[PDB]
């Protein structure tokens, strides 16, 4: 599929918590990394629109794209950087303890794999636990 914002919007409405669903969308986003900025914009908008019980899966997709992008270049890391902290704060406010434990694990993975520098990791931790 060629890239369009509307096609991405439709894929995000269909995203589920399965390994195949997150991975398949992520691979498309990495293929279309030239468009990482509008990807992040659409991603954020649809995260905020999504029902509480689907919000963690948005952050899982962000995890997959950012991590799988590292071998390609800094662009996805940089373009998620300005919204990722408020994304964590949002999901944290919108979900329960159980979901927060899942979010915390993503953060621990990010710390151990140096997905972001400590400045951003410290902001993510404050967003979850402050």
């Amino acid at each position: 599929s060629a890239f369009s914002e509307a096609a991405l919007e439709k894929k995000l409405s269909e995203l589920s918590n399965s390994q195949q669903s997150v991975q398949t969308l992520s691979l498309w986003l990495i293929h279309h990394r030239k468009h990482s900025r509008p990807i992040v914009t659409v991603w954020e908008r649809e995260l905020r629109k999504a029902k509480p019980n689907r919000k963690l899966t948005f952050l899982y997709l962000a995890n997959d794209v950012i991590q799988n992008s590292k071998r390609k270049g800094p662009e996805f890391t940089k373009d998620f950087a300005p919204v990722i902290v408020e994304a964590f704060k949002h999901v944290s406010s919108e979900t329960d303890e159980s979901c927060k434990k899942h979010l915390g694990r993503v953060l621990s993975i990010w710390e151990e794999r140096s997905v972001y520098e400590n400045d951003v990791l410290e902001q993510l931790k404050q967003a979850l636990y402050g």
Binding site: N17, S18, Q19, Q20, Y60, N63, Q67, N68, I109
Partner: peptide
Amino acid sequence: PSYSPTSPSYS
């Protein structure tokens, strides 16, 4: 089969 956030190839 549910998503695993450790699944991406790294670190």
